[PDB]
Amino acid sequence: YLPAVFEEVLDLVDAVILTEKTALHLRALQNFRDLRGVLHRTGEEWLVTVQDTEAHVPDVYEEVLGVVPITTLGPRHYCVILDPMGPDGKNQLGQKRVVKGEKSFFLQPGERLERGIQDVYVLSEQQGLLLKALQPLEEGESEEKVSHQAGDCWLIRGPLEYVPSAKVEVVEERQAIPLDQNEGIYVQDVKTGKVRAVIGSTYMLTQDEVLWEKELPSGVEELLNSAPRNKTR
């Protein structure tokens, strides 16, 4: 290319190789159309991928930001995208989206993940999850398909795979209570304060229950005759 008398050469541009594992983050420096003829006003940010071109060229009206990696959610992985791209083409700022199930995408412009690629909750017959409805009376959208108030809590157990819905928060992992013949623990139903003693077979704590402490007034060294006895047992 011979530079004309009126033209001035600055430098060569290198079209960054767009692979399946990478995407190009660009931003408009003025109102124009890119190589594919797409309307890009000043300030707007967009992504470029293999679907568009195998190598897009940093244009004079395009500012390169970086290289977006294909956020790959494995078969038992999930993530919570903050400020997710709505259908209108703007970030839903102050909201969040949940995605999972062998999916793979590029993180849309002006977004991020809460934790970033979390392991989908998988829990057996002896493993439970205590959840809390932080938002409002969702009768659909949860495994049970039942309404949860906005503040209360509940427990989900059974051999299944759970994931934090876009309304709820996980409180704790209900576990660790195996009982046999002539053995048990004390539990207090917090809602009513009904202290009781369950014995016999293995028992997981119902949503409103919690381990209760039974004090023995100077009768410990008698019936215990090194380790401090479990006063909830």
Beta strands in the chain (DSSP E): 16-17, 22-28, 32-33, 39-40, 45-48, 55-56, 62-72, 77-82, 96-100, 104-106, 112-113, 118-119, 121-123, 128-133, 153-156, 160-162, 168-174, 184-189, 194-199, 209-211
- 203 to 232: interface string for a copy of itself, x by CB under 8 A: ------------------------------
Number of residues that bind a copy of itself (CB under 8 A): 68
Q: Are strands 112-113 and 77-82 parallel, antiparallel or unpaired?
A: antiparallel
**66 versus 158: smaller Cβ distance to a copy of itself:** 158
Binding piece for a copy of itself, criterion CB under 8 A, among 1-9, 125-133, 207-215, 216-224: 125-133
- 220 CB-side CA count, 13 A: 11
Q: Which amino acid belongs to residue 155?
A: L
Quick check: 20 binds a copy of itself (CB under 8 A)? yes
- 143-202: which residues touch a copy of itself (CB under 8 A)? 149-153, 158-161, 178-181, 183, 188, 190-195, 200-202
What does the alpha-carbon distance between residue 214 and residue 27 come to, in Å, rounded to a whole number?
65
CB of 25 to a copy of itself, least distance (A): 15
User: Torsion over CA of 19, 20, 21 and 22, rounded to 10 degrees?
Assistant: 50
- Which of 13, 31, 38, 39 is close enough to bind a copy of itself by CB under 8 A? 31
Q: Which of residues 37-76 bind a copy of itself (CB under 8 A)?
A: 41-44, 50, 54-55, 70, 72-76
Report the SS3 class of residue 70: strand
Chain residues in the site for a copy of itself (CB under 8 A): 15, 17-21, 28, 31, 41-44, 50, 54-55, 70, 72-77, 90-96, 102-104, 110, 122-127, 132-136, 149-153, 158-161, 178-181, 183, 188, 190-195, 200-202
